[PDB]
Design a protein around this ligand. Structure first.
Ligand SMILES: [K+]
Ligand SMILES: [Mg+2]
Lengths: 84, 61, 309, 194, 119, 73
RNA sequence: AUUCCGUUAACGAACGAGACCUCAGCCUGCUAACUAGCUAUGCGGAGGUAUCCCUUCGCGGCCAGCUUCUUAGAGGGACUACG
């Protein structure tokens, strides 16, 4: 809900739920996208989007808890990304 | 020679599944349950005549 | 006042589709059902059952969707899903006539005031007018006609201007001039398909109900709609009381009666199985008695319930 | 008591016929309340589902089991006639209702215990097991008809006479019946292989 | 067994999606509707699709069904989910913070924030 | 058609159905229902035909299911 | 049933399976039958009280009626529909 509202008000695109592998690399996929920026709620649960973005020159922003992995995180925002 | 009523069927038993293992409750004593191996079709609610009730059934397989 | 259960009739074995009552207030009544049969009843107030099946007719090859009694009462006309209409003689249980020409299922059948013209509604989006002989004089299948199933068709009681009001599944109720068989007025105020149409005995009101669950009343003189009455459930039948001046609607939840003077629900009738002693259970058709002192309701459980004043 | 106008062969009545074995009561159809029939010929579908054949009349099951060995396969009118004559002879000899005699013979002929083969790889090892009531009834019928058939073979005695004698000697545990001896042997083997 | 193949499931899902307004819970009416609004080469396939569509409608009446996107259901969910309470569920009047958070704020210089009280 | 047993069964079924229909069409429906219930409670085949038919035989055997004897040596 | 539900660095597809087609099983509902039948009638034979009545057989009616029985075209019917 937070990401949906953020996309609604800022004007960006939101993807809530499971991320389809190859969305950033499979150019023939129907859901193929070429974002200029990626925002993620949790690096740990959003590992697949981060790994895919690492293959397409896509900068990343993520809310990182104390135990979040920082790999392929360009701008990490230190915050509790588990409580609603 | 006692009479017991089948309360539930545990399943087929033996190498070829020839016998079925069931839990039977004695009619004379309603608080005693025993394990028996049965040959031939059998379902819940059936009554068997046990020529001897001392033995406990074990999986044939 | 209030309506209470009087008894049950348990001859049919499938959904009851329609009920017909004699004008002379005779004991006999005729009801259709999905069991492909028409049952002629012999009502008996005394005894364990309010009525018993005097005779059964099984000429039709598919579900019988409608049945109407003639003014004389010795003839009955009923339509079926086989797209064929046949007149019934209530003297020996033998078909008296057959009407052919409808390509798809027939849903509505009505008798003219003079019992000299027959109007039927079919799923082929067409309305045809037949005489007693068995020839369709005219067929309404032009652009003016509806674009979906013609669920219900009724005859205007007012003999001064012969007119027919027909519903459909395209959210439109149309009025056709009988004299020239041309469009007289078109009504469009529904959001969901309308599957029932009623006409007041005087001939000044028309109640339309369907999926939307709202009953819309229209004036026959000009077609202007008066007001809307909610039901909260899909509407299946609509009938006007002969003298009490009421409006009873058959809905999936239950049968509710409205008073047109006050617009308030006169009474809500819910069927309870314990009192008498498929889970989806509701009234599919209803019809008032000749004198209006009794209401007959058909249900999906193949049972007919009788409500008395 | 339950009264039924239906009479087997229009000669025998199902009234006063009661099964006296709780174990196999539910798998015998020989009572006035359990759909009595006029003849043991009913051309029904009893193999559609498990346990359905228990609803077939016991007399019909005996008739069916009398059609064994190829030369007699499908010859049901002859088997029905044989059953009718055997019932007449039973009534003559014992003065009881033939249906009751048949029921008692079935009850007394069914084995209660058996030894089932166990293990594998060419090993002769057996373990005693119980017999279900339906299998007990089936074995009783098979043993009775087998005894009658073996008695009738190469003997001037008719098949009906042999069947009647077998049923009479099985209704009471006379041990002169082939079925009784076979059941005793089976139970002895089961006891030995406990 | 009786397991509807991919064809029947897809046809029922698409038909319900496109014509949910006219759908009913009666098999015969559903099969008539399918005959009207779809081309099915075989009568048996039409009957199977009608039955599965009736089953899907019965499931939908209870609540949402995965794989079927009805416009009214989504609109109603959005309307219900765009509402807000009269009072926000964030109380800034009283905030219970451990001592460590107190040193945190003191280092930040925010030692006078209203509503911040030690346990 | 048929044989000696099939003809008898068909005759009895026809008698039952004819009586039921005659009572339905020229006698009170109540009595027709009573006789129909009495007939059905005894045997359902008295009014409903048995659908069993002979299974066609398949090549490779004498019967519908029976196959020719197989030998390996 | 690699049939489906789902899980998911896979997403979309193409074959096989299924669908399909033939035969059989239900239709007192439709069309039509002197190269298929039924019903009643007219006449005739036989029997029974021998006229009239009853039972059973044989022969005609393309202007006696009809399609239950037979044939074969169109359709309906089952979808696990309902508990
Ligand atoms: K002999
Ligand atoms: Mg015919």
């Amino acid at each position: 809900r937070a990401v949906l509202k953020f996309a609604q008000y800022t004007g960006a695109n939101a993807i809530a739920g499971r991320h389809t592998p190859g969305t950033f690399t499979n150019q023939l996929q129907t859901s193929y996208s070429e974002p200029r920026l990626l925002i993620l709620t949790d690096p740990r649960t959003d590992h697949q989007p981060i790994k895919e973005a690492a293959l397409g020159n896509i900068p990343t922003i993520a809310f990182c808890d104390t135990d979040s992995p920082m790999r392929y995180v360009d701008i990490g925002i230190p915050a509790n990304n588990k409580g609603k | 020679t006692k009479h017991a009523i089948v309360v539930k069927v545990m399943g087929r038993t033996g190498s070829r599944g020839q016998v079925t293992q069931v839990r039977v409750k004695f009619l004379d004593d309603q608080n005693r349950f025993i394990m028996r191996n049965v040959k031939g079709p059998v379902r819940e609610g059936d009554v068997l005549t046990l020529l001897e009730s001392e033995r406990e059934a074990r999986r044939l397989r | 006042e209030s309506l209470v259960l009087r008894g049950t009739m348990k001859a049919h074995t499938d959904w009851v589709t329609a009920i017909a009552t004699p004008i002379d207030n005779s004991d006999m009544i005729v009801t259709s059902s999905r069991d492909k049969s028409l049952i002629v009843w012999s009502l008996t107030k005394d005894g364990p059952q309010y009525g018993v099946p005097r005779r059964r007719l099984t000429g039709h090859g598919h579900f019988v969707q409608d049945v109407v009694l003639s003014s004389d009462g010795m003839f009955a006309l009923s339509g079926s899903w086989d797209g064929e209409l046949r007149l019934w003689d209530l003297q020996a249980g033998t078909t008296a006539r057959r009407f052919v020409g409808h390509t798809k299922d027939v849903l509505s059948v009505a008798f003219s005031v003079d019992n000299r013209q027959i109007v039927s509604a079919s799923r082929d989006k067409t309305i045809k007018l037949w005489n007693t002989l068995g020839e369709c004089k005219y067929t309404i299948q032009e652009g003016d006609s509806h674009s979906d199933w013609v669920s219900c068709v009724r005859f205007s009681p007012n003999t001064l201007q012969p007119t027919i009001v027909s519903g459909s599944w395209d959210r439109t109720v149309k009025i056709w001039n009988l004299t020239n068989c041309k469009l007289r007025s078109t009504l469009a105020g529904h959001a969901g398909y309308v599957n029932t149409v009623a006409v007041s005995p005087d001939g000044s009101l028309c109640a339309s109900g369907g999926k939307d669950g709202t009953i819309l009343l229209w004036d026959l003189a000009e077609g202007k709609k008066l007001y809307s009455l909610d039901a909260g459930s899909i509407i299946h039948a609509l009938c006007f009381s002969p003298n009490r001046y009421w409006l009873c609607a058959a809905t999936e939840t239950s049968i509710k009666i409205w008073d047109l003077e006050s617009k308030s629900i006169v009474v809500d009738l819910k069927v309870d199985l314990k009192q008498e002693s498929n889970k989806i259970m509701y009234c599919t058709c209803l019809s008032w008695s000749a004198d209006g002192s009794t209401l007959f309701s058909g249900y999906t459980d193949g049972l007919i319930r009788v409500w008395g004043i | 008591k339950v009264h039924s106008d239906v009479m087997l062969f229009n000669r025998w009545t199902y009234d006063d016929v009661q099964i006296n074995d709780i174990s196999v009561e539910d798998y015998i159809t020989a009572t006035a309340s359990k759909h009595p029939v006029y003849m043991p010929h009913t051309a029904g579908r009893y193999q559609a589902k498990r346990f359905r054949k228990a609803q077939c009349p016991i007399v019909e099951r005996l008739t069916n089991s009398l059609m064994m060995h190829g030369r007699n396969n499908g010859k049901k009118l002859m088997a029905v006639r044989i059953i009718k004559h055997a019932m007449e002879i039973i009534h003559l000899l014992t003065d009881q209702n033939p249906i009751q005699v048949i029921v008692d013979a079935v009850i007394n002929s069914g084995p209660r215990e058996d030894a089932t083969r166990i293990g594998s790889a060419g090993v002769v090892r057996r373990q005693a097991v119980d017999i279900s009531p339906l299998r007990r009834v089936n074995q009783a019928i098979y043993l009775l008809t087998t005894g009658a058939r073996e008695s009738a073979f190469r003997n001037i005695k008719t098949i009906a006479e042999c069947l009647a004698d077998e049923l009479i000697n099985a209704a009471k545990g006379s041990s002169n019946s082939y079925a009784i001896k076979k059941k005793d042997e089976i139970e002895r083997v089961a006891k030995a292989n406990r | 067994g009786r397991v509807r193949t991919k064809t029947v499931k897809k046809s029922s899902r698409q038909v319900i999606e496109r014509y949910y307004s006219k759908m009913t819970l009666d098999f015969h009416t559903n099969k008539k509707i399918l005959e009207e609004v779809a081309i099915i080469p075989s009568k048996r396939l039409r009957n199977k699709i009608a039955g599965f569509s009736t089953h899907l409608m019965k499931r939908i009446q209870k609540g949402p069904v995965r794989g079927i996107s009805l416009k009214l259901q989504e609109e109603e969910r959005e309307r219900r989910m765009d509402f807000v309470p009269d009072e926000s569920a964030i109380q800034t009047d009283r905030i219970e913070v451990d001592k460590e958070t107190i040193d945190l704020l003191a280092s930040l210089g925010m030692s006078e924030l209203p509503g911040v009280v030690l346990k | 058609g048929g044989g000696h047993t099939s003809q008898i069964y068909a005759i009895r079924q026809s008698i039952a159905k004819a009586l039921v229909a005659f009572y339905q069409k020229y006698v009170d429906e109540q009595q027709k229902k009573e006789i129909k219930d009495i007939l059905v409670r005894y045997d359902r085949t008295l009014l409903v035909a048995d659908p069993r038919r002979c299974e066609p035989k398949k090549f490779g055997g004498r019967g519908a299911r029976a196959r020719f004897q197989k030998s390996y040596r």
